[PDB]
């Protein structure tokens, strides 16, 4: 689906974020560098019910991919309330898990061992 | 009809120069660059200024 | 000739406000600043980030 699905921070409610300014919508990808979506949402009658849910730490499903909102900028100019939403791919949220243990010394590792060490006992389902 | 051209040439005197303030432009550019920098820092975990 | 005035008024209704994008301006400014920084670095040998 080409529209955006909005799931709240507490995952209690999941709906469709309508009346998105698709002209301002943009999807940026760069290998090993970035993966994000940015757009602007105006509060209208159609999305007034769920316009309060779209905020930081909310989840947006777009083309089958999940993006966590990392920057929300509500703005009020007269009668129009607009939020500038920037969301990064959920993979980068893996930075919330830290491996405190250290394998001291110089040693020849492979990618498999380092990856297993990095994502050991994850609580975020990675 | 002469005073029609009177007003037309009087208001042709208008300077075709619109001076735009540089300070606000610089501040907006700085804010957008800061947004980009924060995005890049987030993509690399925390291996940056913060 | 009344509809001349009607149409000209309807077209005067237009807002004389042209919004210009800020992200594009910021990116262009950043690219130009990068060009200047690279020039200065080259003129200083390699005593810079690269």
């Amino acid at each position: 689906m080409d529209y955006v699905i909005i799931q709240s921070m507490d995952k209690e409610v999941e709906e469709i974020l309508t009346d998105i300014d698709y002209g301002s919508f943009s999807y940026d990808y760069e290998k090993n560098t970035s993966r994000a979506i940015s757009f602007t949402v105006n509060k209208t009658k159609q999305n007034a019910a769920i316009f309060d849910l779209v905020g930081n730490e909310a989840i947006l499903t777009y083309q089958g991919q999940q993006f966590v909102i990392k920057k929300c900028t509500p703005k009020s100019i007269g009668g129009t309330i607009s939020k500038q939403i920037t969301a990064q791919h959920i993979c980068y949220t893996v930075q919330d898990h830290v491996q405190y243990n250290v394998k001291s010394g110089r040693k020849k590792y492979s990618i498999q061992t380092v990856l297993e060490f990095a994502l050991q006992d994850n609580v975020l389902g990675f | 009809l002469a005073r029609v051209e009177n007003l037309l040439e009087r208001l042709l005197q208008k300077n075709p120069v619109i001076k735009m303030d540089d300070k606000v432009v610089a501040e907006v550019v700085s804010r957008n660059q800061a947004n980009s920098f924060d995005q890049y820092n987030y993509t690399m975990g925390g291996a940056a200024y913060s | 000739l009344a509809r001349v005035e009607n149409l000209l008024e309807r077209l005067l209704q237009k807002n004389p406000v042209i919004k210009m994008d800020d992200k594009v301006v910021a990116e262009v400014v950043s690219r130009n600043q990068a060009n200047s920084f690279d020039q200065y670095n080259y003129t200083m040998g390699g005593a810079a980030y690269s």
Partner: peptide
């Protein structure tokens, strides 16, 4: 004829202001 004059005067007077909004601030 006079209406044409007044309309042109007001049109150029309004045109004088111009826009160039950054996001919401002027220039």
């Amino acid at each position: 004829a006079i209406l044409v004059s007044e309309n042109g005067s007001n049109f150029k007077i309004t045109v004088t202001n111009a826009g160039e909004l950054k996001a919401t601030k002027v220039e």
